[PDB]
From a paper:
Autotransporters (ATs) are the largest group of outer membrane and secreted proteins in bacteria and play important roles in virulence, including promoting adhesion. UpaB is an AT that mediates UPEC adherence to extracellular matrix (ECM) proteins and enhances UPEC colonisation of the urinary tract. UpaB is composed of an N-terminal signal sequence (residues 1–37), an α-domain (residues 38–500) and a β-domain (residues 501–776). Here we determine the structure of UpaB at high resolution and reveal that it adopts a unique architecture potentially comprising two distinct binding sites.
The αUpaB crystal structure was solved to 1.9 Å resolution (crystallographic Rfactor of 17.5%; Rfree 21.8%). The structure was solved from a xenon derivative by single isomorphous replacement with anomalous scattering. The crystal structure of αUpaB exhibited a right-handed three-stranded β-helix consisting of 13 turns, with each triangular turn containing three faces, F1, F2 and F3 faces. The interior of the β-helix is packed mostly by long stacks of aliphatic residues, whereas the exterior is largely acidic in nature. At the C-terminus of the β-helix, αUpaB forms a two-stranded β-sandwich that is capped by a three-stranded β-meander motif. However, the most striking feature of the αUpaB β-helix is the extended β-strands within turns 6–10, which reach up to 32 Å in length. The β-strand extensions contributed by turns 6–10 and the long loops protruding between turns 2–6 form a long hydrophilic groove 11 Å wide and 12.5 Å deep on the F1 face of αUpaB. Indeed, we identified electron density associated with the αUpaB lysine pair likely to be a bound calcium. Similar to other lyases, this calcium ion would be held in place by the neighbouring αUpaB Glu 314 and Asn 316 residues. Substitution of residues D116, D119, N146, N175, D217, K245, D246, D281, R310 and D336 on the F2 face to alanine (αUpaB_S1) caused almost complete loss of FN binding as determined by ELISA, while maintaining the correct secondary structure of αUpaB_S1 based on circular dichroism spectroscopic analysis and displaying a behaviour in solution similar that of the native protein. This result mapped the FN-binding site to a ladder of charged/polar residues that are contributed from β-strands or loops in consecutive rungs of the αUpaB β-helix.
Author numbering: 40 to 472
Write the structure that this text describes.
Amino acid sequence: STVSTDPVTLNTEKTTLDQDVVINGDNKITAVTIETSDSDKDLNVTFGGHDITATSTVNQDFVEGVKVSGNKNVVINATDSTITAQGEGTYVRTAMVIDSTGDVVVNGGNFVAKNEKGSATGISLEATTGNNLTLNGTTINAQGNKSYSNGSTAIFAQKGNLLQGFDGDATDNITLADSNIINGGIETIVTAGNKTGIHTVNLNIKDGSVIGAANNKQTIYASASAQGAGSATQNLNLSVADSTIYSDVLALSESENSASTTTNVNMNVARSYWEGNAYTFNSGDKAGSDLDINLSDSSVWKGKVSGAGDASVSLQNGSVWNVTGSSTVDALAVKDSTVNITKATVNTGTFASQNGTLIVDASSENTLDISGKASGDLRVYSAGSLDLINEQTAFISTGKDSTLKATGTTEGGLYQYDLTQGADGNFYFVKNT
Ligand SMILES: [Ca+2]
Ligand SMILES: [Cl-]
Ligand code: NA
């Protein structure tokens, strides 16, 4: 028969889904369960193009499209299949839940989660010890209540919870290869409570992947929390290659009763476009957070970075940082690359430039403010202005032991202006007559 209205189990004895699955009700649902544990080697499962839909109005229980359990590796062949978890309820609707301790490779598939009342999550990684998850050509579309900041999560990777802190260490290796997150963010979180919780996520976004859209920016959210004797470390190693990301990146660290909590975000962006803002946020005396942002191989970043945590930005290989709002970092390094500050001021502690380029708007007051040591060589450009340039605007300010060499020319009214170092060490555009 074409459609099962009963839940289906796939396992070593039945690796093929052979009908659509459509479950409706007012109770908990798991429409399809993949049990890997009796597989002698890996398990290879095919959905045969069939769709899977779980819809429930249950308020305080879970709605799941697919659940993957057991302890063997599985490959899920989901090409042309749509896996849906939906229906209005307080508890989260999740298109696919993974508590298997084995690897999970997903080939294709469209994972959809909808919940207008509570949260919706595309894929949740819930193995106690962490999972390897690979998405090849997969699509995720999570739409919860937008009244909630965390309401729509494409990929949810949390260790621990409020009831029981997470005691131990876990690594989730998450790869998006030519995959598309249409809606929902990515959350990589450890809630240690009073335990010692250590969570490392290696998030690889590669080979033509897309997150969000210009008018639909998502959030990549990394968070660590702990209390008292507890301790929490959240590492997010975010590698982006040949891809397009419309997403903020948040590092949040939340400590109570002097528990040490650290959120370390390490971003490498290669041949990619990233549109979105980076933030650090520390709550509590012993909370620390950091952002290490490196653009290489002709990458473009359009966004801003701020927060009370530590942030470092490095650009190489003709990369561009197009600054969209006031930004503050500890350190900015530019090699054969461009920072465009036509629209906003960058504040940095240190600055190092090697064949670097600064784009300014000579008619604005958007400047490069370096509080500490600036070094190297920088070319400064501005489009011509119909109006004269303010010769008292320090378009580059430096701190001490600064050895930066900065040059450039622009046009203001009928005059040429030359970037000139003043007696104060800062750089100003000076009318050349
Ligand atoms: Ca932006
Ligand atoms: Cl606890
Ligand atoms: Na099969």
